[PDB]
Design a protein around this ligand. Sequence first.
Ligand SMILES: Nc1ncnc2c1ncn2[C@@H]1O[C@H](COP(=O)(O)OP(=O)(O)OP(O)(O)=S)[C@@H](O)[C@H]1O
Ligand SMILES: Nc1ncnc2c1ncn2[C@@H]1O[C@H](COP(=O)(O)OP(=O)(O)OP(O)(O)=S)[C@@H](O)[C@H]1O
Lengths: 574, 143, 143
Amino acid sequence: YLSKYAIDMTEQARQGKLDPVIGREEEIRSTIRVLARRIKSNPCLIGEPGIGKTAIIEGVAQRIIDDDVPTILQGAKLFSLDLAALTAGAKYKGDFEERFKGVLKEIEESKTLIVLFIDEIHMLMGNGKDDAANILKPALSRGQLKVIGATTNNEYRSIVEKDGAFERRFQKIEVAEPSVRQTVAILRGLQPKYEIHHGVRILDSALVTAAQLAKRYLPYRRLPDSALDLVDISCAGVAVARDSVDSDTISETAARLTGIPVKKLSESENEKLIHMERDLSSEVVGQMDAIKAVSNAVRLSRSGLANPRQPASFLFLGLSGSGKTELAKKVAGFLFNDEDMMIRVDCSELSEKYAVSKLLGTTAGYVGYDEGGFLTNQLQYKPYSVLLFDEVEKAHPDVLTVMLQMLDDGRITSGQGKTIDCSNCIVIMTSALGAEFINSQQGSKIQESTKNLVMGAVRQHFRPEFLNRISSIVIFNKLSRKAIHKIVDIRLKEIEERFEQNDKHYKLNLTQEAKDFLAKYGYSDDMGARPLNRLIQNEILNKLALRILKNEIKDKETVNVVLEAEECLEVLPN
Amino acid sequence: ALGAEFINSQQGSKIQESTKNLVMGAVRQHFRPEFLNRISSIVIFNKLSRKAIHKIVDIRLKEIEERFEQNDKHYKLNLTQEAKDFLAKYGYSDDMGARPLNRLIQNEILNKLALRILKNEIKDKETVNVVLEAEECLEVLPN
Amino acid sequence: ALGAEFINSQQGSKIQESTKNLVMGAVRQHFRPEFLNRISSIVIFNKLSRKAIHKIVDIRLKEIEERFEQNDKHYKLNLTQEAKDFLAKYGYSDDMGARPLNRLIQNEILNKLALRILKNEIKDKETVNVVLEAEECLEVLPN
Ligand SMILES: Nc1ncnc2c1ncn2[C@@H]1O[C@H](COP(=O)(O)OP(=O)(O)OP(O)(O)=S)[C@@H](O)[C@H]1O
Ligand SMILES: Nc1ncnc2c1ncn2[C@@H]1O[C@H](COP(=O)(O)OP(=O)(O)OP(O)(O)=S)[C@@H](O)[C@H]1O
């Protein structure tokens, strides 16, 4: 067997239709340290899939065919003849190894000094630890020549990396995530031929952009692949458009994944974090301090002093006035524009300081399921979520402490091991029980004595590391009387859009006197604070239904109409 | 080699005591007792040594001496202690066998020959000049 | 033979009805009684001490080469007592014993021999004589 599943290349390097992309040369030089390397003749290279681990090996050939490098190994076999020949040898069983053995003689004793390479070590050895690919490999490898595979790390690879045939054999030397600046030098070097065969012409600055931005925000698809897409994405519009710019190639992409790039293309970071801050003021008023308290490590977030792995967040004081938990996540969204952030864990099951039920729960060693599948998964999902807490934590101090780990420091104690990060994750434990002392309010604001003390009563309540680090504060005077009121127009403008504003432009009117009557009643002293939404909607939504029933009128309206006496009964006519 | 991993753990290049019997243990696998009576004996391929092989390797040229050049022109082969040692500690195997370096040994030969067929002064008596990827070497010839 | 033959006894060929019993269940564990009832006879193997193996010697001495085409080398060997013992030293491996042991006892003694053939002084004659690592005894008798 000769050329069939093989990658005949060095020629395609020697004739050179290959397009050089020159990455990190070191591990190659490291790899070059193979040529006569013996004891363990080779390392490996472990990336995630998309990184050109072999494009390296391709670039290696560029390091090779171009010669003027060590000719200690000079004559060449680089070519990977596996493919699927594993099962794809013939019409029946047993020839897989033949399929390589049919390779063996047409690969017989080496004139050409160059070891070749097959893909993964798990493309190597077929399934792994199977006869496929001549499971035992001194005799050729210590023998005519060698080969190389490569993959991503641990488990499947680790198993055969412990002993098997690699007991004597290769290490792994792993290029990084494609780094910062070169990536345009990459990209711009990618430019000329790739961009020359892509379309039109081009200029720098945009090239910088998604580079940053794929690097940004884009752990999945971190690789230029998207730019490489953006590349084709680029010509996509215009070359078409010309058949009959601004990084706005990136825009619709950044529209695609973000939902608008004006979300992604957007407040840059830091001033704009502060602009974010003032836009969160724009969001919700109430204690500016609360805002400002929340504003604190905003700047410290992502900027770092000791680590970004610092958790930066604004420890919550459990209560719900307006933005409260909600906007706290909304801002947390309004950080990343992503509302979704993190869920809540019911701490009910968490009652003790231990259970099989924990945010980790199981270790994944033995039968069961993952408890707290969130950060199990939520990071598998997503970086930089909100968090989840309770005014009485019924949670296990275990994890709380195991998160006091992640609490004080940044990296969290991954139960299964893999603090994939704490980078942008900045969130604040939400607890307070002092409601009856929280009940201490007069006027629009509270002077602090109580707020020291139940604080104190809590300050020592659950032990200090909790209450030790992580400054910022959350304060509740609630709404005094009106100020919340503006929420209505929100509440209003929560309406029309949700489906289509088109449905009803009718936009009505709120007759503050009602909104008073609405609010004054409608939401408790304590809270009672949701329903008027859930409510006033209705009797109105009746008219909605109603005026949608027999249907004489269509307009954009202003309602502003109202009369136990507890009901003056708003309504609205045609 | 079913037993050889007993000396994988470096054990008894000279076996004594019960190792052979522990060695004889894995025997029973492939074996059967009818097979027993009809079996003469049991004999190793040993672990050798440079103490052995450092001389053995020598033979390997006296081995290969007249291969290519039949009667044409012989050589001299000054080596001394480096060009005694070098290529042995270069290419021997403590795991594969006598196998590996042989083919290697073939290599450096013809390379110098490649040199010397590139050259052809180097008429009959030939000595060897060797000094210190891996395996830093020199291994040259005057001419 | 599967059973408390495992213990055998530690006593002697009598062992005991115990083991003899121990087997019966150990028989009747898995097996089929009327089929077991198909057994005509209860037979067993015992502990043979010296005298047996002592004789097994006496047996083997002649015993092997006997049939051989030309024993015309007229092989008497010897004992006194001594010669019996040297293997009877090792004479019985509790596990394996003679048939394995003799197999080499066969060999080694036999191994000793084409020597005297090669020792090219005695040709057609025999006696054995020996004296005693602890090895030497081992045949080799001059003309
Ligand atoms: N300068 C460079 N040096 C080395 N490789 C590069 C360079 N620029 C781009 N590449 C890689 O070249 C690859 C060509 O496509 P493929 O290698 O098939 O995809 P790949 O997944 O990157 O390769 P793997 O999986 O890492 S071996 C791209 O995926 C890039 O990751
Ligand atoms: N402007 C606002 N005024 C009052 N409540 C608001 C406002 N914006 C959001 N919310 C509330 O944000 C809540 C989510 O955060 P939480 O702090 O858990 O509230 P809560 O603890 O359920 O008690 P509430 O919200 O005061 S009834 C929702 O229940 C909404 O009532």
